[PDB]
């Protein structure tokens, strides 16, 4: 049928989502000063990471397109940085060191994911205009 | 096959038992001391009310029978009301009152969560007989 | 296709890193000092169970060589130690002996969560050598 554009939009809509909660689980690790529950936070970060390289495995051979593969390097580039900085926080609270967890969340992290999310936004737009013009050429076909 | 049966009862099945870990994690939003967590938990809360809305979005079009369909639309219904109220404890706790906060989640929250659940509970064992019966149907056809 | 071997080593491999995200939810469990949200994660591992023993429901009919088949009833028998053990420290910290629940986590949870891990981590590595022998086989076919 027409279900490859329906499972980008609904991986990628995912995508931004988790990343947005992934926003608040880093800087609960950076500012809770409950150690047993940061290290379950970084435990679950520890497997949300995972998750999502799968997921990105999944929808890279589906991003053909110019504008949609420039957006996606884009976010293959940032998201190391993104996760280098995560895990900075992370290992600097896991250490002992939370003024300085907390000061490479202000200075490094949320700008990192601020862009992530921009660039996570370009894409799920981008993808939605997609989505419609290939549903009108799908109507086109099944009438006529 | 008869695979239709199966997904509606699995899905039906993981419904009712993350209302079940949400309605502790409202709890945890209205009763923590703990700042950076129940803002984690919040954002938590908005994704999986995204996943949960896709559900229903999956499950709508399998759902015609009379009784399940009467069933479904109460649900429908009384989830508003919850969204409502969880929406509200979250964000008064979010807003620095917090007694407010644990207040709405006795007086209104648990309240409709409980509905709520005894919707999913019935949905469910409706949808378990009505499994057993299609069981016997497909084995009364694979056998003749 | 090829997909069985693959989905085998997906399921799998998400499973030994859901255990590790579980041990961490069990310490937090025992040694927090935040009851709403010791409730919390007690209901979350209550709905991890279910989604786990659903996974194990998938794969069972997948692992039918000997030595997959032996250690996926080692795991079976170590499993239901595991899950009594987490259950108990999640008991006794619900009924305000959290002394004994922290002991429980030393002296029966984290050896029986090792001695799991250890069974998930060799399934996982022989599933990936059965993966590439599988692979080898089908490149074998559609090669000739």
Redesign the interface.
Known sequence: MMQEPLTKE?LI??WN??V??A???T??I????????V??????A??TT??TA?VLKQIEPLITQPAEREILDKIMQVRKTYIASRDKVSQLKADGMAEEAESTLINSYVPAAQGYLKLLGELLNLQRASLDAKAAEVEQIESS
């Not at 950076?30 to 529950?37: F, I, M, R, T, V």
């Not at 290290?39 to 679950?44: G, H, I, S, V, W």
């Open positions: 609904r809509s995912d989502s988790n947005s909660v926003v608040a689980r800087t609960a950076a500012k809770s000063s409950d150690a047993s529950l290290q379950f936070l970084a435990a679950d520890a497997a995972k998750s799968n």
